[PDB]
Design an enzyme around this catalytic site. Structure first.
Site, PDB file in Angstrom:
ATOM      1  N   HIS A 144       0.806  -1.231   0.000  1.00 43.82           N
ATOM      2  CA  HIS A 144       0.000   0.000   0.000  1.00 43.82           C
ATOM      3  C   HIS A 144       0.842   1.285   0.000  1.00 43.82           C
ATOM      4  O   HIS A 144       0.758   2.116   0.919  1.00 43.82           O
ATOM      5  CB  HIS A 144      -1.016   0.013   1.165  1.00 43.82           C
ATOM      6  CG  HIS A 144      -1.938  -1.167   1.247  1.00 43.82           C
ATOM      7  ND1 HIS A 144      -2.737  -1.359   2.359  1.00 43.82           N
ATOM      8  CD2 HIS A 144      -2.201  -2.145   0.345  1.00 43.82           C
ATOM      9  CE1 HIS A 144      -3.422  -2.467   2.122  1.00 43.82           C
ATOM     10  NE2 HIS A 144      -3.119  -2.986   0.930  1.00 43.82           N
ATOM     11  N   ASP A 163      -1.499   3.555   3.433  1.00 42.17           N
ATOM     12  CA  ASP A 163      -1.412   3.184   4.851  1.00 42.17           C
ATOM     13  C   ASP A 163      -0.287   2.188   5.154  1.00 42.17           C
ATOM     14  O   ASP A 163      -0.182   1.708   6.285  1.00 42.17           O
ATOM     15  CB  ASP A 163      -2.774   2.676   5.383  1.00 42.17           C
ATOM     16  CG  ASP A 163      -3.154   1.250   4.993  1.00 42.17           C
ATOM     17  OD1 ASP A 163      -2.420   0.629   4.195  1.00 42.17           O
ATOM     18  OD2 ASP A 163      -4.154   0.751   5.514  1.00 42.17           O
ATOM     19  N   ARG A 228      -6.760   4.251   2.673  1.00 39.97           N
ATOM     20  CA  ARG A 228      -6.132   2.936   2.701  1.00 39.97           C
ATOM     21  C   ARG A 228      -5.047   2.826   1.617  1.00 39.97           C
ATOM     22  O   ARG A 228      -3.872   2.930   1.949  1.00 39.97           O
ATOM     23  CB  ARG A 228      -7.183   1.834   2.511  1.00 39.97           C
ATOM     24  CG  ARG A 228      -6.613   0.441   2.789  1.00 39.97           C
ATOM     25  CD  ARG A 228      -7.723  -0.571   2.677  1.00 39.97           C
ATOM     26  NE  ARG A 228      -7.254  -1.951   2.804  1.00 39.97           N
ATOM     27  CZ  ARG A 228      -6.801  -2.686   1.794  1.00 39.97           C
ATOM     28  NH1 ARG A 228      -6.726  -2.173   0.564  1.00 39.97           N
ATOM     29  NH2 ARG A 228      -6.428  -3.942   1.998  1.00 39.97           N
ATOM     30  N   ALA A 269     -14.997   1.597   6.162  1.00 39.21           N
ATOM     31  CA  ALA A 269     -14.743   1.149   4.787  1.00 39.21           C
ATOM     32  C   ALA A 269     -15.984   1.521   3.967  1.00 39.21           C
ATOM     33  O   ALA A 269     -17.088   1.012   4.220  1.00 39.21           O
ATOM     34  CB  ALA A 269     -14.496  -0.356   4.751  1.00 39.21           C
ATOM     35  N   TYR A 271     -19.212   3.489   2.889  1.00 35.08           N
ATOM     36  CA  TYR A 271     -20.170   4.302   3.652  1.00 35.08           C
ATOM     37  C   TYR A 271     -20.104   3.915   5.124  1.00 35.08           C
ATOM     38  O   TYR A 271     -19.628   2.818   5.417  1.00 35.08           O
ATOM     39  CB  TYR A 271     -21.585   4.032   3.125  1.00 35.08           C
ATOM     40  CG  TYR A 271     -21.711   4.282   1.641  1.00 35.08           C
ATOM     41  CD1 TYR A 271     -21.843   5.578   1.142  1.00 35.08           C
ATOM     42  CD2 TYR A 271     -21.772   3.225   0.742  1.00 35.08           C
ATOM     43  CE1 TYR A 271     -21.966   5.814  -0.230  1.00 35.08           C
ATOM     44  CE2 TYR A 271     -21.888   3.446  -0.630  1.00 35.08           C
ATOM     45  CZ  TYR A 271     -22.008   4.744  -1.108  1.00 35.08           C
ATOM     46  OH  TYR A 271     -22.138   4.955  -2.456  1.00 35.08           O
ATOM     47  N   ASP A 273     -22.006   2.471   7.212  1.00 35.47           N
ATOM     48  CA  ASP A 273     -23.251   1.712   7.113  1.00 35.47           C
ATOM     49  C   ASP A 273     -23.328   0.432   7.953  1.00 35.47           C
ATOM     50  O   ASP A 273     -24.393  -0.204   7.969  1.00 35.47           O
ATOM     51  CB  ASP A 273     -23.513   1.373   5.619  1.00 35.47           C
ATOM     52  CG  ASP A 273     -22.395   0.625   4.878  1.00 35.47           C
ATOM     53  OD1 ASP A 273     -21.473   0.089   5.553  1.00 35.47           O
ATOM     54  OD2 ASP A 273     -22.488   0.499   3.638  1.00 35.47           O
ATOM     55  N   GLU A 309     -18.498   0.503  12.446  1.00 36.74           N
ATOM     56  CA  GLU A 309     -18.274   1.748  11.723  1.00 36.74           C
ATOM     57  C   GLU A 309     -19.090   2.906  12.371  1.00 36.74           C
ATOM     58  O   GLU A 309     -18.561   4.004  12.570  1.00 36.74           O
ATOM     59  CB  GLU A 309     -18.720   1.584  10.267  1.00 36.74           C
ATOM     60  CG  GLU A 309     -17.885   0.599   9.467  1.00 36.74           C
ATOM     61  CD  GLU A 309     -18.305   0.558   8.011  1.00 36.74           C
ATOM     62  OE1 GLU A 309     -19.526   0.566   7.748  1.00 36.74           O
ATOM     63  OE2 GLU A 309     -17.418   0.503   7.135  1.00 36.74           O
TER      64      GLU A 309
HETATM   65 CA   LIG Z   1     -19.078   0.481   5.329  1.00 37.11          CA
END
Ligand SMILES: [Ca+2]
Ligand SMILES: [Ca+2]
Ligand SMILES: [Ca+2]
Ligand SMILES: [Ca+2]
Ligand SMILES: [Ca+2]
Ligand SMILES: [Ca+2]
Ligand SMILES: [Cl-]
Lengths: 452, 453
Positions: A144, A163, A228, A269, A271, A273, A309
């Site tokens: 990364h 990252d 990321r 990661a 949204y 959600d 999250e």
């Molecule tokens: Ca998510």
């Protein structure tokens, strides 16, 4: 967005284009640019070579080789950043980033540094000279690295720094720094360890822009945080900054970069959600015998702290314009149809770049206001429509040019009817039938697609 | 976003403000505006009354009553749109929308029309005169009327018109027109049946702007399509258009309105994610005996065709900036905590408006670039931050002023330290414990909230 199936990917053959291989068996070709001289310029990440291809004759010249570039056979390090100064006729500079030895390193697991460096093009000798280090002592690792380098309309350098692969595989137990920012003491001391998972904005001499945002009152080279692996960065004609970034088992992203924005990684990661991901912090695990179940934090082994999250306490969170892809908690992350290469079956596409289609006198019908995003693990180039102001995406990511190739970069010719693409030398890709192959159709190639 | 729990809503009491009730017992108070005369103007949806309140004393005057407004006790129709011309000193006009009888209507089930009309304010008589219909023959029903009317910085009228309730409750079997667009022939004949689930953009004389977007090869009054019940519409200082919209059992939305965009309804609720919603088209069912399970399309009775959000072939689909709220397929849409009033426990907030907070001399610290979104079913006013360019939201929707009230509209004073709010006269709201009540703390009120550090 909802994942496309292997059969939907296989149908993206793009029969309205003729394919022609220009160059083959390049050594890890990485960045591709349309030059101010109307020639195609490309880099080899492994060797530090900078190449120029004549689009009319196919002839190639190694313009320059960046000395002492460090590249590990099992690493994504080497020669990374590559951009021309926007007023090249009146400012003949090339800006790069690369992995170089850090002679001050004490930690044998991290012996290198990243350096942003400028070169001057000499027309009389047709080579590069007079190197100038702009910013050194930047984090370096095998994973990364990202390293996309562009010059904005404000004439500042924008640079993606990943990252470093913290919180996964070989760097599983290292604490992720994407949410961390420098103290005034660290910044004064040129300690850039927090420059991981960021978009940096620098002056052309490498100094801190006086109008950069602040984080905990500190104005550093940081422009945005919480990324990321952002391998794609591209300005639109109206000054907006579009970006692509690889997510973990899910949620690769298309982002709109806004000053001081926090893009949520690793706490979020895609949204915010709570769907198909949670943040399991292995640096805070009970011990190093703990296994990563590789369930994207949906299910974790005992002994590892894990947070939803929706429980994250972060500020200025900016959600993506599009996710490739978002899945529910019931999703199967252990698909045996990919054999030992389980990651190939995950609901992601691994975007490697991001390119704003400029049109032209021979522009492709319906491609106005589009972003092109190459995919490494699916062997497609996605076409993503936006509205004319680049404020939102329209509809979905349309796959094109399906092949058993890892697509690394894409550009179009000035007239707009020809696309030029780079392909990786080696690696894994999903075949038409959903299984994994490491037999690449066109290893390390520069390929031309002409609209017919 | 992920739904907040009853305990998180209950804690949102906003102890940093003083509350003062200015008026109560208003008859379905609907739109609230800060007037050109620095007075508060408000409408009564049921009566067609336009009231003016002195902010210093709290005294109220009935300025005008729009004649022949049609309102049903079980309907969301009546006096809707309400806006002032932006250069009022040189152009003293008031623009409204309202439900009126349609004398050319044959259908007894749909007897009305919606009309956008202009009035002239007469300073000497202190009333409205010279009515002129700008756009008539618009759809009208008892459900999802929306009707927010604003004047843009381009001096065009922007108007929200809901999906009329098609594909739910009393209008279950009517085919939803949110995705439908007019033909050139229909425009030539002023046939506006496809003007449902849209944001319209009109010239001040009601004519079609030459620079309006094209849909299926036709430029009409349509600016955006694919909306369900968009009750909030507000311009930002840099000319962007923000909107709030009621979703079905899930996915109420905050949208960025983009010229020519398709906001997905009824094929897509919220993001195109196949999560907690699918489109069950009852107008294409085998017969009218088919029942709606009210499971948001996730689970349906046999005989209704279902299309997943990912199966829809759409053009110019624009996803929301934020959803209130998105849930997974395993979500239970039949929560016993709400008893027989099941809809109050669904993962939604029922946003009633959208207001761009502009700050001022006494701006509330940390409220720069915020959007205020009143909630009917949760009894809160959400504070949603955006970046300084109004290109994205930042973080989540922060609840404020939790009470057993249905919040209908919100504005701020020019100094920015005072908020003015309207509440509904009657209806259901979620209490602190998560249960349902129809005992409203402040029925049909105008409430003042004053900031304190
Ligand atoms: Ca998510
Ligand atoms: Ca992100
Ligand atoms: Ca890959
Ligand atoms: Ca029609
Ligand atoms: Ca929508
Ligand atoms: Ca959805
Ligand atoms: Cl320190």
């Amino acid at each position: 967005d909802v994942p496309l199936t292997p059969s939907q990917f296989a149908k993206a053959k793009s029969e309205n284009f003729d394919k022609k291989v220009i160059l083959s068996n390049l050594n890890k070709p990485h960045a591709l640019l349309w030059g101010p001289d109307n020639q195609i310029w490309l880099t080899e990440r492994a060797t530090g070579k900078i190449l120029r291809v004549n689009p009319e004759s196919g002839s190639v010249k190694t313009v320059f080789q960046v000395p002492e570039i460090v590249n590990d056979a099992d690493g994504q390090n080497g020669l990374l950043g590559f951009a021309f100064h926007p007023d090249f006729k009146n400012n003949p500079y090339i800006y790069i980033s690369g992995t170089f030895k850090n002679p001050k390193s004490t930690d044998k697991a991290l012996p290198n540094q990243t350096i942003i460096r400028r070169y001057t093009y000499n027309k009389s000798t047709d080579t590069l000279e007079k190197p100038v280090d702009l910013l050194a002592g930047l984090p370096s690792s095998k994973d990364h690295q990202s390293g996309r380098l562009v010059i904005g309309p404000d004439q500042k350098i924008y640079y993606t720094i990943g990252d470093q692969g913290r919180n996964q595989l070989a760097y599983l137990f290292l604490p992720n720094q994407a949410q961390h920012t420098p103290t005034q003491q660290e910044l004064n001391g040129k300690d850039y360890h927090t420059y991981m998972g960021k978009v940096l904005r620098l002056n052309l001499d490498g100094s801190i822009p006086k109008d950069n945002p602040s984080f905990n009152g500190v104005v550093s080279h940081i422009y945005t945080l919480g990324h990321r692996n952002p391998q794609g960065l591209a300005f639109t004609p109206n000054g907006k900054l579009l970006q692509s970034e690889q997510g973990p088992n899910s949620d690769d992203e298309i982002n709109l970069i806004v000053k001081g924005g926090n893009y949520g990684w690793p706490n979020v990661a895609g949204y915010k959600d709570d769907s198909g991901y949670a943040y399991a912090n292995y640096s805070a695990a009970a011990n190093k015998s703990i296994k990563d179940l590789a369930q994207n934090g949906v299910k974790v082994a005992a002994g590892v702290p894990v947070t939803k999250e929706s429980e994250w306490t972060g500020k200025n969170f900016v959600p993506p314009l599009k996710t490739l892809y978002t899945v529910q908690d019931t999703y199967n992350y252990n698909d045996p149809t990919c054999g030992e290469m389980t990651y190939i079956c995950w609901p992601t596409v691994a975007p490697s770049s991001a390119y704003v289609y400029k049109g032209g006198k021979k522009a492709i019908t319906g491609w106005e206001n589009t972003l092109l995003v190459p995919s490494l693990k699916r062997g497609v180039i996605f076409r993503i429509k936006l509205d004319p102001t680049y404020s939102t995406t329209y509809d979905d990511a349309v796959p094109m040019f399906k092949s058993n190739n890892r697509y690394r970069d894409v550009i179009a010719s000035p007239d707009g009817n020809v696309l030029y693409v780079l392909t990786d030398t080696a690696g894994n890709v999903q075949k038409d039938d959903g299984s994994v192959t490491n037999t690449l159709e066109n290893p390390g190639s520069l390929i031309k697609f002409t609209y017919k």
